[PDB]
């Protein structure tokens, strides 16, 4: 197995079992699930209530530093019945580790800004309001970044047909650059790649 297969390492997988055992111990009002990614990373499934609270515990302590906020992001899943998702991602400079914090939501239910905890979620929260539509309350500012001034669709979610709904073109009949509905010169062919037989037995979905 050795030559071409990535050699594993156990030690990293013993501790991040422990150190994550007990952050389901000392904040049970919030944390509803925790696990260990086979590559030695953690995922803490947290109710939407604690967001400002939990980080603040992760913000300072002598057993968990997690000062460096690296990557806020999102994922949007239909047939999850609460659409979107957040994923915070935080590096603790002293202890050399990554621990990610997953919090679900919907469009209508607001989520509360993390901005006083870290000042680097200032932009990453302005963006998401543009793309997916999640609305972060009590945010020192909320505006439009990455997108034009016209997009009323909030694209990256799964209902926006790739080409947006209005192509643009300039005409000299007056003196503006105006917007006419999208008319392509090629279909954007849809290929179909998904092959049968279920090559993965381990992930086998429940028998049903």
């Amino acid at each position: 197995t050795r030559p071409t297969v990535r050699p594993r390492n156990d030690v990293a997988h013993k501790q991040l079992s422990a150190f994550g055992e007990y952050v389901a111990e000392i904040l049970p009002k919030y944390v509803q699930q925790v696990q260990v990614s086979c590559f030695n990373e953690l995922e803490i499934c947290i109710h939407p209530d604690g967001v400002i609270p939990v980080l603040t515990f992760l913000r300072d302590h002598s057993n968990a530093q997690f000062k460096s906020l690296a990557d806020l992001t999102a994922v949007d899943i239909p047939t999850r019945q609460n659409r979107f998702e957040i994923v915070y991602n935080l590096l603790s400079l002293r202890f050399n580790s990554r621990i990610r914090v997953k919090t679900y939501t919907d469009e209508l239910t607001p989520i509360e800004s993390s901005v006083p905890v870290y000042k680097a979620a200032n932009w990453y929260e302005r963006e998401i309001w543009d793309m997916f539509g999640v609305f972060f309350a009590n945010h020192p500012d909320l505006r439009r970044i990455l997108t034009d001034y016209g997009f009323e669709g909030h694209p990256f979610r799964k209902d926006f047909p790739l080409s947006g709904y209005v192509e643009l073109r300039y005409d000299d009949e007056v003196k503006r650059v105006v917007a006419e509905p999208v008319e392509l010169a090629q279909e954007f062919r849809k290929f179909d790649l998904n092959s049968p037989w279920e090559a993965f037995p381990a992930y086998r979905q429940p028998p049903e």
Binding site: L108, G153, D159, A185, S195, P196, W197, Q205
Partner: protein
């Protein structure tokens, strides 16, 4: 805490345009392309809409 229970059937409005009421979506289990016997392309209930005209350019 402001829990404020109520019941209003969830709906959302304004983001798409006229394609709200014009169309009819469909929810169906894919049928297994029959040229091969692999049974794993089943098992997820997708949805896909009506088809409107494609013309020639």
């Amino acid at each position: 805490i402001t829990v404020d229970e109520k019941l209003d059937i969830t709906t959302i409005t304004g983001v798409p345009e006229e394609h709200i009421k014009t169309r009819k979506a469909r929810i169906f289990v894919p049928a297994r392309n029959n040229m091969q016997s692999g049974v794993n392309n089943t098992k997820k209930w997708k949805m896909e809409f009506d088809t409107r005209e494609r013309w020639e350019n």
